[PDB]
């Protein structure tokens, strides 16, 4: 590991600098290095890891969608070479590599050492997210979908037992699981039901929250609401 010679604290400090500089490839490398030190991650450090790789993979998914669209148009009255397919495959292969890197970190060994709900649910959700990103480009497709489903479901079970309905991690988990149902699993009715009950159960729990926790939860709830508006 190219970050093996750098102090854990220095990697974290530089990941925060990279975030301010919007250098998310650097941020991912720093946080990967931090994870590979072997120590568990704090809540802040976990979110730095999530921020870095979500932005990296986020740019790859956007590029892949553009290229896939151009590729599908080429395969309709369309004039013909292999370049579009080749370059889409290049981005796709790079995207899959990032997803495998994250899944590798969760498997070695973030998840097995995560005992607390906030950490375990966070990592299992992340596992679901990155198997979902793999599913988006897959055509083993079924096993990838099942791996996402299984990760999300284990996370849902723990969050429902151990976290209040308004917990931001639980809310973000349910949001992404509902996206999985709608966009990946061809289960729009499951997606709508999950988003509804997640929103309603959080609504009924807002009265227990501080002003700052209320802002955090309602911000995420609005995404659930926005999706329901698009889905119904």
């Amino acid at each position: 590991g190219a970050m093996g010679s750098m102090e854990r604290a220095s990697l974290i400090q530089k990941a925060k600098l990279a975030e301010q500089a919007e250098r998310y490839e650097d941020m991912a490398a720093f946080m990967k290095g931090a994870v590979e030190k072997g120590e568990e991650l704090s809540c802040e450090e976990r979110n730095l890891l999530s921020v870095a790789y979500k932005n990296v993979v986020g740019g790859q998914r956007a590029a892949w969608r553009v290229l896939s669209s151009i590729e599908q148009k080429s395969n309709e009255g369309s004039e013909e070479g292999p370049e579009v397919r080749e370059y889409r495959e290049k981005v796709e292969t790079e995207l899959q590599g990032v997803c495998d890197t994250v899944l590798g970190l969760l498997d070695s060994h973030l998840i097995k050492e995560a005992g607390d709900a906030e950490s375990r649910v966070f990592y299992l959700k992340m596992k679901g997210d990155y198997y979902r990103y793999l599913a988006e480009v897959a055509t083993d497709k079924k096993r990838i979908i099942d791996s996402a489903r299984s990760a999300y479901q284990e996370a849902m079970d723990i969050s429902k037992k151990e976290m209040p309905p308004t917990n931001p991690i639980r809310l973000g988990l349910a949001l992404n699981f509902s996206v999985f149902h709608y966009e990946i699993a061809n289960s729009p009715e499951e997606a709508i039901s999950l988003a509804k009950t997640t929103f309603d159960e959080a609504m009924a729990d807002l009265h227990t929250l501080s002003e700052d926790s209320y802002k955090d939860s309602t911000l995420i709830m609005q995404l659930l609401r926005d999706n329901l508006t698009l889905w119904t």
Partner: peptide
């Protein structure tokens, strides 16, 4: 149009 997923805190 694609569904909205969790945003970074």
């Amino acid at each position: 149009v694609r569904s909205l997923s969790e945003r970074l805190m």
